[PDB]
């Protein structure tokens, strides 16, 4: 007999849901976590090569052809949605407090590169590299330095370290002005450090930009090389790890289990449970991804193209790096948004020996999405295979307070997971009424 009643039902095993399921199980809540799909990870799963053909190709190749070209399916764990972890980001903080580090190992990403006039340049990760970089001239570097010294010396508490700037009242452009920074330096700080994909931030309060730049500097400072970490065996390990945390603390899991019907309190539209092939399960609230409640979500008005490329060689002009980010700032291509490339390889157990995965992504701004990626495809050298997908981004219409249907946002075009942990924290506050407070797992 299966228990009918739970504190919370969670639908979909994307990482946002799996983190929430783990945190709530840790809080002592009785959680039932269901997925219609036959595997963990939802839209940000890592999949095998055969699955990649099934998903993105018209006529999947034979097992024998696939294995001769690419080796065994077991060697491939290919992210559907590229993300790195900021080394001092919130996801690392959650991983450490929950000991989900016991279920997922991490390696540093070798570097972050920025595109300028057809070439790529490694963004400095230390003082020697900062001295060496041709990205700025000497006098501009001196102005850059005073800016970063202010970033380091600013204490909220103490108005004497503010240099006449107010992070809430001054725009980021005004902050740049105080330090006399030119437009190319603004683009570099904004796009390579704050990692904005557009220039909207210039006319917005400085605070969020200040915090993002501080986050970047703290992250590169943790271990050097770059601000990023990446999980061994791919991003799919993350939801699996948080699902294990939830199971340890009492959570119950069902996969390959369609939701036949969502149940609502009569004449109210409020959640009460779900009917499945295994029975009817009840809880006072549900947490779910957009695919379970499409009617309760809206498009953000953005579509992201993601091109998963398989190479049999390293990316040119990266010193044969095992992993990297490339950033193509919008101004370099006359675009409205940056193009990213995320490159990982056999060093991270995501492909067979000798191969590289290069996943290119951007928000579509033209009528020929494939053509928008050409400047990025050109950076990769010869490409063995491409698997192309386009995703529309969704967000909940409402915060869930009215109907106890607490929905996550689709995974966005940003190159790392900070916006995903922002979503976790926001959903947790919505669900529980108090900010998330992490305790160290004992």
């Amino acid at each position: 007999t299966i228990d009918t009643d739970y504190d919370v039902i969670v639908l979909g095993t994307g990482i946002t849901e799996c983190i929430l399921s783990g945190l709530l199980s840790v809080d002592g809540k009785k959680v039932l976590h269901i997925d219609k799909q036959d595997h963990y990870g939802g839209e940000a799963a890592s999949v095998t090569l055969s699955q990649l053909y099934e998903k993105f190709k018209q006529n999947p190749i034979s097992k024998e052809e696939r294995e001769s070209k690419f080796g065994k399916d077991r060697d491939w764990n290919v992210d559907l949605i590229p993300k790195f972890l900021m080394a001092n980001g919130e996801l690392t903080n959650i991983l450490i407090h929950t000991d989900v580090t016991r279920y997922v190992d991490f390696k540093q990403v070798s570097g972050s590169y920025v595109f300028k006039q057809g070439k790529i340049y490694k963004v400095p990760a230390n003082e020697i590299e900062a001295i060496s970089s041709p990205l700025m001239g000497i006098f501009e570097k001196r102005r850059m330095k005073k800016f970063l010294e202010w970033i380091s010396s600013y204490k909220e508490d103490d108005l004497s370290t503010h240099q006449g700037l107010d992070l809430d009242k001054n725009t980021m452009d005004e902050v740049y002005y105080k330090f006399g920074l030119g437009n190319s330096t603004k683009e570099f700080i904004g796009h390579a450090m704050a990692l904005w994909t557009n220039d909207d931030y210039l006319q917005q309060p400085a605070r969020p930009s200040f915090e993002r730049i501080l986050l970047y500097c703290q992250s590169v400072a943790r271990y050097g090389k770059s601000p990023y970490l990446y999980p061994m065996y791919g991003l799919g390990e993350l939801p699996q790890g948080f699902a294990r945390l939830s199971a340890i603390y009492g959570g119950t899991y069902m996969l390959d289990t369609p939701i036949d019907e969502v149940l609502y309190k009569k004449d109210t539209g409020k959640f009460e449970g779900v009917k499945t092939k295994l029975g009817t399960f009840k809880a006072p609230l549900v947490i779910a991804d957009p695919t379970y409640f499409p009617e309760k979500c809206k498009s953000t008005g953005q579509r992201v193209i993601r091109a998963i490329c398989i190479l049999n060689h390293p990316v040119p002009n990266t010193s044969n790096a095992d992993s990297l980010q490339i950033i193509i700032p919008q101004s370099q291509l006359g675009r409205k948004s940056d193009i990213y490339v995320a490159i990982v390889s056999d060093a991270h157990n995501v492909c067979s020996k000798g191969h590289y995965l290069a996943i290119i992504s951007t928000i579509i701004e033209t009528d020929k999405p494939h053509i928008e990626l050409e400047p990025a495809f050109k950076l990769l050298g010869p490409i063995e295979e491409k698997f192309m997908g386009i995703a529309e981004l969704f967000e909940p219409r409402e915060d869930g307070s009215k109907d106890n249907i607490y929905l996550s946002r689709s995974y966005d075009a940003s190159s790392h997971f900070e916006s995903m942990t922002d979503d976790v924290k926001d959903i947790y506050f919505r669900v529980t009424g108090h900010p998330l407070v992490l305790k160290q797992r004992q």
Binding site: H39, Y40, R74, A87, T92, L95, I96, T101, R102, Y103, V104, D105, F106, K107, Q108, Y223, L229, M232, Y233, G236, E237, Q240, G241, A243, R244, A247, I248, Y249, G250, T252, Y253, M254, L255, T257, L278
Partner: protein, 194 residues
Amino acid sequence: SEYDYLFKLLLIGNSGVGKSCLLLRFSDDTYTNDYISTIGVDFKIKTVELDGKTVKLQIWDTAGQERFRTITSSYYRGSHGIIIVYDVTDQESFNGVKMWLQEIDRYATSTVLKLLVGNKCDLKDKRVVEYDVAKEFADANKMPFLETSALDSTNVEDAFLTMARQIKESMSQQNLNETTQKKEDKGNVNLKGQ
């Protein structure tokens, strides 16, 4: 505190067969009648002496994920040996072993070691899986076989020792060296490292 080899072991098998009790009997030498835990066992570490070698075992438990056959594929990563448990009083749990074998074939390395354990052998009146049938099955699927009782301790230490020996003795020198303490630095980042 130092060790010769470190092996990663998993327990697998249908819910209710006594995997968590088997692990607690081995690790803590305790048994709780009608065992139910609010927080499931994650893993236990136990160092054993094996033909004059110190073998550290990190033995993973399922955290209940087997109930509806939702074991995370990550569970099998880096495993060296897998102990498949059924209940000698429960024919279906024995039949379920064929399915777990298929999972292991799918998610674990081709060279993983396997062992079949028939648990609850203390329940003599209620036995339905005949020893010779289980043994012939284990033979036909390339694994040794023991019947155990977490309750009264029958064969529990020996089951875990059997597996640690299947591994240590089956491993190519390349594979065995990678399990040594000197080779524990895998080039991964310690997130709890200042």
